[PDB]
Design a protein around this ligand. Sequence first.
Ligand SMILES: Nc1ncnc2c1ncn2[C@@H]1O[C@H](CSCC[C@H](N)C(=O)O)[C@@H](O)[C@H]1O
Length: 204
Amino acid sequence: TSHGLIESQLSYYRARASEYDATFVPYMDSAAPAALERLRAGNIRGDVLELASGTGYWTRHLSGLADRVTALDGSAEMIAEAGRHGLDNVEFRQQDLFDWTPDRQWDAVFFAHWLAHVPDDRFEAFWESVRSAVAPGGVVEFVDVTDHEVAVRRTLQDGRSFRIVKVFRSPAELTERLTALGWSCSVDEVHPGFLYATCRPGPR
Ligand SMILES: Nc1ncnc2c1ncn2[C@@H]1O[C@H](CSCC[C@H](N)C(=O)O)[C@@H](O)[C@H]1O
């Protein structure tokens, strides 16, 4: 995967930030209760890190569960949108997640719809950075879509064209891959098409 692809994908979300919620909210509505049940199940506690926080759809929920949230997104436009929620215990930071190495640790790491934007060749390095971010006894949870070209082309009507990574991975694929990377995982289809995963890092 090229930097061109990574930048294109990020640029798409920079362009979409102001209209993101109008699309995302009704998209997520049916699966939201099942996802929120797992989110509130007791692992999102203490100091929480969110990756690819977007408009703060999940950040709003994390803020209510955590003592403090650090929320990272590559788009300043997204961070600006996320500020609308007025969450007092959240620090937003602009960060390209493909350049990211943490300099502290958190009790829980959460991301929604992020992993499917991570191509196979960047998967291991991403999980190495996540591993470093997890405090002793910490946990990683995530939401994504299952599957039952690495990227899709999306062209806006003005002509802007983007490539966006779309690698939906099954519960079996995710469990197998994360096992291979030294994690223990439970990945469950909480609503048709939608997965919730809980992951614990092994000794290495
Ligand atoms: N290279 C990159 N580094 C950090 N964030 C990136 C990125 N490429 C895309 N993103 C962010 O990934 C998010 C994808 S959409 C998912 C947003 C949110 N988690 C939700 O579920 O609603 C966008 O907010 C986009 O800005």
